[PDB]
Amino acid sequence: KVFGRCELAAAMKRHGLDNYRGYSLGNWVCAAKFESNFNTQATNRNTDGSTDYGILQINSRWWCNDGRTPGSRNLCNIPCSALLSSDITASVNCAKKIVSDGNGMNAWVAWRNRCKGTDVQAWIRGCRL
């Protein structure tokens, strides 16, 4: 499933992340354009020996189960590949929590320097709420 602009923006609020745990609507949308290019099928293996699964570029090493990454906490405890299906309905479970970790959104390489401080009100513009 390959998404459009206003095709990825509503279902975020449908799952409850609006201003979630102090994280608002302005901090989300920019990142997947820079981790998956609005794609759900972008699998890439980081030299850390782990791969980045899903549209969030998740490493099998810390949170999921891919079977080729030993010493992985597999903390989410689900198929490291279910994190790939068009139905994201379950993926963010690990999204809403990995933040409770306390070291922030700083779990991703791009938004941090590629998306932070950036005009975000603009990603939520041109669409309907």
UniProtKB/Swiss-Prot annotation:
SUPFAM superfamilies: Lysozyme-like. Its main location: secreted. Its EC number is 3.2.1.17. It is found in: Secreted. Lysozyme C is capable of both hydrolysis and transglycosylation; it also shows a slight esterase activity. It acts rapidly on both peptide-substituted and unsubstituted peptidoglycan, and slowly on chitin oligosaccharides. Lysozymes have primarily a bacteriolytic function; those in tissues and body fluids are associated with the monocyte-macrophage system and enhance the activity of immunoagents. Has bacteriolytic activity against M.luteus. Belongs to the glycosyl hydrolase 22 family. This is Lysozyme C. It comes from Gallus gallus (Chicken). The gene is LYZ.
